[PDB]
Design a protein around this ligand. Sequence first.
Ligand SMILES: [Zn+2]
Ligand SMILES: [Zn+2]
Lengths: 43, 98, 76, 66, 1101
Amino acid sequence: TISDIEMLLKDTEIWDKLLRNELSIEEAKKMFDDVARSYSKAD
Amino acid sequence: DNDEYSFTIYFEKIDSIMALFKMREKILNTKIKGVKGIKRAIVQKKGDEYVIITDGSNLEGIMNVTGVDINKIQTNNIHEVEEVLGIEAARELISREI
Amino acid sequence: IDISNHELVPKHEILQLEEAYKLVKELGIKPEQLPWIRASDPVAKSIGAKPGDIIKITRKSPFTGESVTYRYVITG
Amino acid sequence: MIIPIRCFTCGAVVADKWEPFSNRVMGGEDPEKVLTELGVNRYCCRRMLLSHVNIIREIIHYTRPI
Amino acid sequence: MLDTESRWAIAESFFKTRGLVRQHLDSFNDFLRNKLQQVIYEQGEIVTEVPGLKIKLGKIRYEKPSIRETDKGPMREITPMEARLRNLTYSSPIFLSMIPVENNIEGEPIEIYIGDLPIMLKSVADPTSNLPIDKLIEIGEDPKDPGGYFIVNGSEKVIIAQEDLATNRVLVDYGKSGSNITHVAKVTSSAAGYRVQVMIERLKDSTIQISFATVPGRIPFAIIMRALGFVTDRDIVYAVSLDPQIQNELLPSLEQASSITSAEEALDFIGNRVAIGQKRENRIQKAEQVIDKYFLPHLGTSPEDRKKKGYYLASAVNKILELYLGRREPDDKDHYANKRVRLAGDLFTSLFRVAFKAFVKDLVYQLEKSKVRGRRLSLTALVRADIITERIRHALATGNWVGGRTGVSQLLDRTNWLSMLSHLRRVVSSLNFEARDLHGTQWGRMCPFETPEGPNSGLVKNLALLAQVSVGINESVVERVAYELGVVSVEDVIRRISEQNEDVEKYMSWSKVYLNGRLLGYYEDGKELAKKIRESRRQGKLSDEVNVAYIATDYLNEVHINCDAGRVRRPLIIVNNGTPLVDTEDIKKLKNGEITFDDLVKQGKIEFIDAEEEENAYVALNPQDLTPDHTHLEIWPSAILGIIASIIPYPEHNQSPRNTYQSAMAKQSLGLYASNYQIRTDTRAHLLHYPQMPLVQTRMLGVIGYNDRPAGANAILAIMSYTGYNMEDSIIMNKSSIERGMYRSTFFRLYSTEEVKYPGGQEDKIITPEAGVKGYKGKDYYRLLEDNGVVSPEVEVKGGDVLIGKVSPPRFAKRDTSIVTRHGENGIVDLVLITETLEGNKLVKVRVRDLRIPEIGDKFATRHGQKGVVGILIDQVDMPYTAKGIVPDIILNPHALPSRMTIGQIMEAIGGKYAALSGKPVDATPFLETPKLQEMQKEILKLGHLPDSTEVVYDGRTGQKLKSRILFGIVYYQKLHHMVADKMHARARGPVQILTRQPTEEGGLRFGEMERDCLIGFGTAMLIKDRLLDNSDKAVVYICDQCGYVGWYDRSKNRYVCPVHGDKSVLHPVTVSYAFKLLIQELMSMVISPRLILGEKVNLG
Ligand SMILES: [Zn+2]
Ligand SMILES: [Zn+2]
């Protein structure tokens, strides 16, 4: 189940990074899609 | 066959009579027809349409029954609909039941 | 089997990231502070919702007709 | 306990009528005629005379020494 | 064709010869006459460890009531009034004639004093039961009190009847759903001094498991049967039943016990569970004792009776199978054939049993010590009688009972006559929504209306007007008569099927015969045996305590014979061939007085039947309903009610909740509770100055003597909405009537002390006025205290004035224990009494009276359940007067009538008006009222008023006639003791607790969670802070900045000090509730370490 907790961690970190306007929307969308694809492949 | 509307059963490796009585209890507690969880179903009239009031709750089993639309099924319990229809349907059912 | 056609199920939609950003900026909240829906829920799985997204749900209500609520997609 | 001096409803003295009414009713006369000719016509006084217990007769035996 | 008067003659004879409280007196007389010697005989003998010494208990006797005035006084006899005044116990001595055996010689018998037992009032024990009226007046006793209560420590304690499931009988019921258990049968064996529950179960497989208290686990049925004396499975099968279809269900149990062939295998199988780790012989012995003495001791504890017990067990198993096969329904826990009521007799004999066991234990100890040491052989100096004398008393005073049940004895309620009678005739159920429900079996045994509202609805009941509790007889005589009648024993039947070849189907059609729930035998036909037993009882050959019933269900037929105690049974007129046995000659003799109700029941005309016997009885309410099919007739159709439900006039016109509420609130009404209330000393007493007997009176009102001790007054009632102060169940009362003494009352409070002496050198708490000792209240408070230290009678007492001046030496220098009159209560000293207690201490009682004039807020209630406070007091001028000038005494809002549906109130108003006008008596007994409503209205019209009881009313204030007529009546009203005078609790700034620093004792009102949430819901913040912080436990604490622990301010040096940091840290003051500081310190007393984090009071920003 550690994959789900780690995915939640990564998603909340990406969201907090977006809230600080570190990078634009499209790159954050790529990061979300990439992490979802990477850690749903394991599951 | 024995008599009509009756019959008889014998066994080879029956062993102890305790096993025989446990076997009898197993035979009596055998389901003949119908999906699990439902005690009785009664047809009732709601106006130009006849519905079924059911004393049991089994959403998946009734959904599998042919002749029933999956779109309009009302269940008293809120947990199985949450398991099957999601959480928003569960919230709507909770509000409607209250 | 498809359950989105059920009467109890509201209309679920997955909104784009720019709309989510505008929503969280206007509400002034972190995304996890929204009420959250599990990614394994059948309504979210039907629309292919992924964790970290925000789901726009329109419910039928007698006061305004259609009410818009936002849910957060969490992991399991 | 002891008959009230005055009728509760109307301030009419009924205490002095207890002895004649009780003595004549105990003598074997119907209470209606005795009440009518005694001088009580309002039923508020009649319930005062009719429904009385005279507990004071029993209490004088069980009196506080004081 | 017995008319109303003929049947009321029988009812009046019943209530005349047999008192209102007869169950208590009957049980106590049965205890004294039989059970006192029965306990001694079941004890048998006193055997000591030394072999030569022995004691035999010959006979027991009770003397007349008496007290030991001195150390060796002659035990002078006393009167119950003296026991009440001096806080004594109205008890009588017990002399037990035990003969001492020393070196195996009998010697001469000697009777010794073993203790004092409290005796019931108006029983066989006390002499006041048979005294004449004048002698009762002379001694000081009220001639009308029914008795039935003990006088323990000066208080009238009465043993409430206790209702519980019948013992020694097996009840079957289904097991819990979704479990391996399918059927359960429980039997409760009530032994001499202990009680054992045996549970028999049928699992999913047809095996049967038997268990009981001492043996862990479940013993198989056939194993325990073989342990009891059975040798092979055939005997077990034939003992269970005789039907092959029901016999076939024992085979799995038998083969589960197949390995157990002999009795010893079963014995040590049980012994393994009973106690593990000892040798086989010890296991066998332990199993033997536990089986003999802990299995079914009511059958017998001797090894000889063991075989008998086994048969009983088999019968129990039979019922389970009958339940499993579908032949019988589960037994009802609510049916009165299954419920028994224990009165003072059974309880008090159990208490004497345990007290005598303790006494004999102590006597054996002392005797063995004396023998091994060598002392006097006489038993007079080794009696130690108080072991009983205190013990019994300790049970009656406290009410906590030996058997584990609580609240057996309660202080007698004496608010009025009705409360005392109801509290005497009360049955409390020991035990569900099913038990609270009214059962059809309660007809004629328990009142359907009288029951408390709330958690006790249906669990506390009152004995009906014509309900009698069985006293009980010995089982042996009934067993002998049943065997002589022709009942074939079960063992004989089994023998003659097994030893001799006979038809099993011949005995399968026979009727089983049970006695007290135990299978007694078989008979040809149940109906014939039942008729024989009934006729034998009616003719007087058999005892009247035997009740026989015949079930004759299509599946099973049985005969049940009951002779045990506790059965609630009611009398019915026997009807033969459609004509009752009681005839015109019997009624004429009753009216003349030649014969009484007891003569009627002895002659066989009227018989008492229980629920089981009433199962096959067919009863008719009235002689015109009588048919040849009918078996019985009711003596009194309205006798199904209790003492209070018979107070209501026309109760069948009211709603049942109204009658129930009337029964509940008629015990609270003010009135004359006793004619000798002036000499009596009660802690809380009430007196209505001018009580009036009801104008609308039922038949039973004169029987219970209520019209001689009335608890209310007739009030001219107008049903109209005169002002609006009578809304929401409120009433308006004429203030001029109140000023003439309409409902003025007096409230008496008693303060009593004992000049107790405690160990020391002549140390006593002498009663004397106080001069300069510690705790001194103030010189102003002792102004009215006399020289001897007790206040003189007829003085005004205000607030906290002292009544008795007492000084006490310290236990570990005088201290003030003087009595302070309650701060709220103000009154006049009524009576002062000085006595000497048995132990020699001075006892002083002071009774203070307070005059209560009715006011706004005082609670009044009618005889129908219309309770309400006084909305306002209105002068005679303001009240609406009629054309004849009669003004209402009480005005009641008409809107109270239609939702409550109390038609009986209007009927009583019309009846009271007719009674006052015509002067003729009015009888409003339910189902039979004389006269009827129409004749009452016609006579009212004849006397001069309107037939419909309305009359023309003019407005008093303006003088203008009302546009409509107003009903006027004389409904009876009662003043309840919930006065507003003593119901006010208001607190200003005052004392707080030493620990929590919160206000209590005048104490403050608790705010609580729900009010806190209301304040939150309004959104107010400063109001919450005021109500929960400012006005309660407001505190300021200094908290260290770094560690956060609570510090203190040092008064000598202005610097703050931290417990941990010392002086180096700075501390800040924070205002919090002291309860939070207490919580912090209590957590700190744990290993929890709460560190309070401070923050800027300002918003900063
Ligand atoms: Zn008057
Ligand atoms: Zn510190």
